[PDB]
Structures are given as structure tokens and as C-alpha cells.
Amino acid sequence: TSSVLRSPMPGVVVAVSVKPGDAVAEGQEICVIEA
Amino acid sequence: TSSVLRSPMPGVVVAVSVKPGDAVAEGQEICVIEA
């Protein structure tokens, strides 16, 4: 019933586009990480 | 140089574990989405 998203790399989070309670669509941006 | 993480499914974000400026390790939890 649930998905846990993890970072694919070491880096720094530069943007986060969602907060708890927001809906998401498949393919919708969650965050951006710089290497 | 950068990674864009997207939702793998339609759902609702139930938890977000990072904010801009935080470091992440490979495999570190970003968020949890419920279907």
C-alpha cells in the first residue's frame, strides 16, 4: 500500500516540491538532489 | 550533476524526511507515499 522513496546518490537536497498531505501523480517531481 | 526524484505512483505523501540544504546518503529515505 505504500512506497518509500530513497536517494539514489550521495548529495545535497536543493529543492523539495511536496509536503505531507499533498497528492502525487505518477511521475510527479518530489525533490532535486545535487551530487 | 543532479537527480530529480519523482513519485512512482498516484498517492498521498504521508511523510517527508528531508528539506532543502540537507545532505543525503545513497539509500536514505526521502519520503513515504500511500497508494
Curated annotation (Swiss-Prot), chains A, B:
Post-translational events: Acetylated.
Annotated compartments: Mitochondrion matrix
Annotated domain remarks: Consists of an N-terminal biotin carboxylation/carboxylase (BC) domain that catalyzes the transient carboxylation of the biotin covalently attached to the C-terminal biotinyl-binding/biotin carboxyl carrier (BCC) domain.
Subunit comment: The holoenzyme is a dodecamer composed of 6 PCCA/alpha subunits and 6 PCCB/beta subunits. Interacts (via the biotin carboxylation domain) with SIRT4. Interacts with SIRT3 and SIRT5.
Purpose: This is one of the 2 subunits of the biotin-dependent propionyl-CoA carboxylase (PCC), a mitochondrial enzyme involved in the catabolism of odd chain fatty acids, branched-chain amino acids isoleucine, threonine, methionine, and valine and other metabolites. Propionyl-CoA carboxylase catalyzes the carboxylation of propionyl-CoA/propanoyl-CoA to D-methylmalonyl-CoA/(S)-methylmalonyl-CoA.
Disease with which this protein is associated in UniProt: Propionic acidemia type I: Life-threatening disease characterized by episodic vomiting, lethargy and ketosis, neutropenia, periodic thrombocytopenia, hypogammaglobulinemia, developmental retardation, and intolerance to protein.
Name of the molecule in the record: Propionyl-CoA carboxylase alpha chain, mitochondrial
Species whose genome carries this gene: Homo sapiens
The gene coding this protein: PCCA
Segment of the intact protein contained: 658 to 692 of 728
